[PDB]
Design a protein around this ligand. Structure first.
Ligand SMILES: [Zn+2]
Length: 607
């Protein structure tokens, strides 16, 4: 029978780099007081160590918990034997812990040695823990190092402050927990199970959290074995510690910055002319449709209460917007999957009149009367009649003007429409490499009118990322890919910086949309004619106006959203622009913004 026990110490966190290698985070090296605890140190011994250490360190904002107050009170061996004396070893510690009031009389200078006592008390037997204090300077550290021998247990070691660098990707990088705030409390149990200490610093937000396993530094491990009582025999080493592995993003700072500037430019323009007065902002996501790589995620928040403009790149994955007409492709796709439409089917474009409700029109209203229209043309002219007749078909009915609609098949129809939408990413999880994306506002309580509006993008709300995946799906011929913001995992070179490739994050297929290849080609013809058409009803000629490459896309019609991919023949970029609640009917900047993003990218990475 011999006693076994192993202790661990954390290392430097890996760093985060943009597509070109610029660092986005900083490990600033610092020196800290460390404490190594022995099974032999009593609480009175620990008290004596705190008081000696208080002469050398500064303690500013001590926020002691009752648990800590009581531990310090009960340290006195005589006062512990007395407090349990009046009660009706671990169970005996906890019951005696509910026996004293925390209304104790400790001077402010007293509260300081209680804080330190706490820090020493938190360190497990034989382990080496950090003793959090105010920043120590070079001279202050040299004093402590020289008188360490007088406080057995105390030493000076090297730690690291984590800081985020001022860039447009600073919001996406996320946060890491302090060594004082320690391991996050509502998750403490699930980390201890993994191997983490109590005062470890771990990603609590966005990328730091998502790639925690990659960024966390490898630990140096030591074993200690115990004799008879459980006392230290010798201190043997198992594993030598190293800096965490690095991650490189798919986003390039230069490009991201130029998209932010372009969004601000268009937003102010629209704000100035009054069109954007009640608009919450403008968001843009550009993806690579062959891989799912995220090329930029930009956002500009306009506060409707003060008026201020602030960056909001996370809005692309957390905020939801009515999509408008850009979703017409997904509704037509649903008609094909549910046997309502056959290839490029001709419908009458007519006002849609249901009993007990206002007629439904398209943007051109009555200007051309009723006329035959194909699926290609339905996308090109952005026809509501077409998608409304399609939706009504999914519900099992043929449109006749003035019809009373039976709603016996409404849950089934809505389910089928949303199911198709979900295949494109609209209302479902995108797969993106962040801990918590919104999946959109998809209401479970709805009626017939809602089902119909949903068909032309006027009910379910989606995020800008979902809308980008949708059009990247069309660009990738129906094969929907998980977006990823990280490109590969990287080693470190000789002095803690971007070394060589460990594991390139590879493409992930999620599903393939259940439509024919020729049906997918009909959606491609539609999206092309939106931008290249010659009809008075053609809706997106602005996509082509000064384009350096051939753009295909779809406008959203209040609402000035747009989606696009390019080049048409061999798509390498797919973009979604979300510009909610813009009242300018005159000129539609949605397509213009998407074109410019695509031009921006083409100038940066030639296609
Ligand atoms: Zn051993």
């Amino acid at each position: 029978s011999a006693s076994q026990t192993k202790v661990t110490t954390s290392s430097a966190r890996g760093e985060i780099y943009d597509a070109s290698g610029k660092p986005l985070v900083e490990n600033t090296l610092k020196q800290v007081v460390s404490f190594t605890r022995s099974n032999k140190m009593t609480a009175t011994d620990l008290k004596e160590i705190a008081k000696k250490l208080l002469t050398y360190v500064s303690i500013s904002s001590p926020n002691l918990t009752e648990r800590q107050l009581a531990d310090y009170y009960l340290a006195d061996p005589e006062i512990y034997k007395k407090t349990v004396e009046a009660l009706p070893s671990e169970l005996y510690n906890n019951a005696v812990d509910s026996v004293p009031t925390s209304q104790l009389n400790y001077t402010e200078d007293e509260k300081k040695e209680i804080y330190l006592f706490s820090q020493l008390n938190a360190v497990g037997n034989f382990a080496t823990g950090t003793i959090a204090t105010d920043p120590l300077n070079d001279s202050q550290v040299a004093v402590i190092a020289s008188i360490s021998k007088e406080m057995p247990g105390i030493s000076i070691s090297t730690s690291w402050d984590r800081k985020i660098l001022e860039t447009s990707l600073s919001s996406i990088v996320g946060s890491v927990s302090s060594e004082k705030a320690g391991l996050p409390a509502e998750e403490a149990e699930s980390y201890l199970k993994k191997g983490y200490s109590l005062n470890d610093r771990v990603g609590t937000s966005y990328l730091e959290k998502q790639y925690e396993e990659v960024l966390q530094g490898k630990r140096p491990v030591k074993e200690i074995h115990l004799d008879k009582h459980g006392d230290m025999e010798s201190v043997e080493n198992i594993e030598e510690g190293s800096k965490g592995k690095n991650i490189k993003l798919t986003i390039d700072l230069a490009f991201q910055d130029s998209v932010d500037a372009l969004l601000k430019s268009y937003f102010n323009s629209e704000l100035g002319n009054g069109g954007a007065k009640y608009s919450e902002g403008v968001y843009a996501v550009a993806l690579n449709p062959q891989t799912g790589a995220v090329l930029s995620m930009s956002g500009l928040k306009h506060d409707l209460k003060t008026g201020e403009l602030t960056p909001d790149s996370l809005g692309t994955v957390t905020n939801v917007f009515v999509p408008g007409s850009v979703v017409k492709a997904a509704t037509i796709s649903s008609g094909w999957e549910n046997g309502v439409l056959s290839g490029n089917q001709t419908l009458t474009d007519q006002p849609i009149v249901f009993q007990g409700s206002a007629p439904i029109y398209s943007w051109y209203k009555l200007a051309y009367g009723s006329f035959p229209i194909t699926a290609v043309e339905a996308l090109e002219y952005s026809s509501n009649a077409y998608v409304v007749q399609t939706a009504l078909g999914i519900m099992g009915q043929t449109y006749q003007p003035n019809m009373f609609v039976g709603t016996s098949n409404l849950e089934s129809a809505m389910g089928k429409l949303r199911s198709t939408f979900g295949e494109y990413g609209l209302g479902s999880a995108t797969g993106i490499d962040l801990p918590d994306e919104s999946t959109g506002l998809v209401p479970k309580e709805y009626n017939f009118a809602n089902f119909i509006t949903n068909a032309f993008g006027q009910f379910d709300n989606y995020t800008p990322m979902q809308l980008a995946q949708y059009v990247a799906t069309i660009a990738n011929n129906g094969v929907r890919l998980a977006p990823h913001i990280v490109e590969g995992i990287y080693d470190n070179n000789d002095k803690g910086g971007l070394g060589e490739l460990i594991q390139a994050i590879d493409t992930k297929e999620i599903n393939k949309v259940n439509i024919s290849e020729s049906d997918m080609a009909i959606l491609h013809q539609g999206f092309y004619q939106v931008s290249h058409g010659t009809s008075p009803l053609t809706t997106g000629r602005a996509f082509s106006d000064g384009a350096t490459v051939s753009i295909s896309g779809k406008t959203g019609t209040n609402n000035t959203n747009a989606v696009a991919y390019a080049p048409t023949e061999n798509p390498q970029i797919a973009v979604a622009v979300v510009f909610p609640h813009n009242t300018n009917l005159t000129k539609n900047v949605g397509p213009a913004i998407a074109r410019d993003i695509i031009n921006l990218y083409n100038q940066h990475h030639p296609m």
